């Protein structure tokens, strides 16, 4: 035998779209083709983010796009996730590419003069990515993250799953 | 596969081919030199085995110069050979003194 540190186990990185969605399966095929041929780090990033699970693809509201594109006028927002609508604040003019658009978010983006694009048009127009802004949504805002750990802890207590006789 | 990895091997092979042939020829000629040197040694021994032959005819003492030269050398070479012998004996005395402590 050979004195190895550890034996070969599957690498914990997803290499394909999860689930049986036919359209998401093709997008991974499209960007897997672009990443291999163009060898652009943009396509490798989009391909990697297409394979994340639903909880690792957090939503991005229109207010986040509005703030992140204030100094990028002739640019395209590229978020590999659903784009929701922040009804509290107005939507300026901007181009957004996303997997999914909320019905109220798409109406607000289009009414302001912007365009809601999908990832097939973005690859057609900007395959390597030239006037794009990469955006991902916040991950620590999940209310499940509050209960992780020990609530008796002295530094960062958990949040005590509610149940019997919770005061 | 050697040539694809070490293209210099063709040159080195030819040099080794030269040396092997040259050493064989050098060995062949020297073997001839000893054949007549030993033959000259043989005839002196057969000449001096007449010491067995015999009025107080006592103590056959044998000739000192019964061995004959087989390869001829110039005056400088004959003088240098004696000098070389003296050098060799000095090293033998030098090595023995060191080892003998």
């Amino acid at each position: 035998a050979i004195d190895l540190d550890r034996h070969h186990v599957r690498k914990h990185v997803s290499k394909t779209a999860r689930g049986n969605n036919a359209y998401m399966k093709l997008l991974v095929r499209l960007y897997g083709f672009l990443a291999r041929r163009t060898q652009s780090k943009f396509a490798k990033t989009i391909l990697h983010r297409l394979c994340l699970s639903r909880v690792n693809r957090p939503i991005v509201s229109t207010s986040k796009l509005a703030c992140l594109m204030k100094k990028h006028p002739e640019e395209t927002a590229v978020c590999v996730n659903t784009v929701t609508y922040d009804s509290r604040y107005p939507v300026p003019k901007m181009n957004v590419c996303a997997l999914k658009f909320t019905k109220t978010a798409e109406a607000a983006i289009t009414k302001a003069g912007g365009k809601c694009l999908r990832f097939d048009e973005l690859a057609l127009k900007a395959p390597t990515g030239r006037k794009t802004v990469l955006i991902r949504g916040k991950r620590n805002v999940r209310e499940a993250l509050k209960h992780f750990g020990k609530v008796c802890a002295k530094k960062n207590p958990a949040k005590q799953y509610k149940g019997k006789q919770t005061k | 596969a050697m040539v694809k990895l070490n293209p210099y091997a063709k040159i080195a092979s030819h040099k080794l081919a030269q040396v092997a042939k040259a050493q064989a020829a050098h060995k062949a000629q020297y073997a001839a030199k000893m054949e007549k040197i030993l033959a000259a040694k043989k005839e002196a021994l057969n000449q001096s085995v007449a010491k067995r032959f015999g009025g107080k005819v006592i103590k056959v003492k044998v000739e000192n110069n019964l061995l004959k030269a087989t390869v001829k050398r110039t005056a400088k070479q004959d003088a240098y050979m004696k000098k070389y012998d003296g050098i060799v004996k000095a090293n033998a005395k030098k090595y023995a003194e060191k080892i003998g402590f």
């Binding site: - | 596969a1 694809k4 990895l5 070490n6 210099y8």
Partner: protein
């Protein structure tokens, strides 16, 4: 010295280094233990280190 009971070692000669690399030589390329077959693969790996063939390797 600390690992003496588990190894043996010494000082190699030129011929030992030659025969070891020529017969058992291999390079780690892209995580793969590829044996030495040509000088082109040696140049691709160690070319930046001014090593282009199997003799500079030796």
């Amino acid at each position: 010295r600390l690992v003496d009971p588990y190894v043996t070692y010494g000082y190699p000669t030129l011929e030992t280094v030659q025969k070891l690399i020529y017969k058992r030589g291999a390079l780690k390329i892209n995580g793969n233990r590829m044996p030495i077959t040509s000088n082109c693969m040696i140049k691709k790996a160690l070319g930046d280190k001014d090593v282009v063939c199997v003799d500079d390797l030796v």
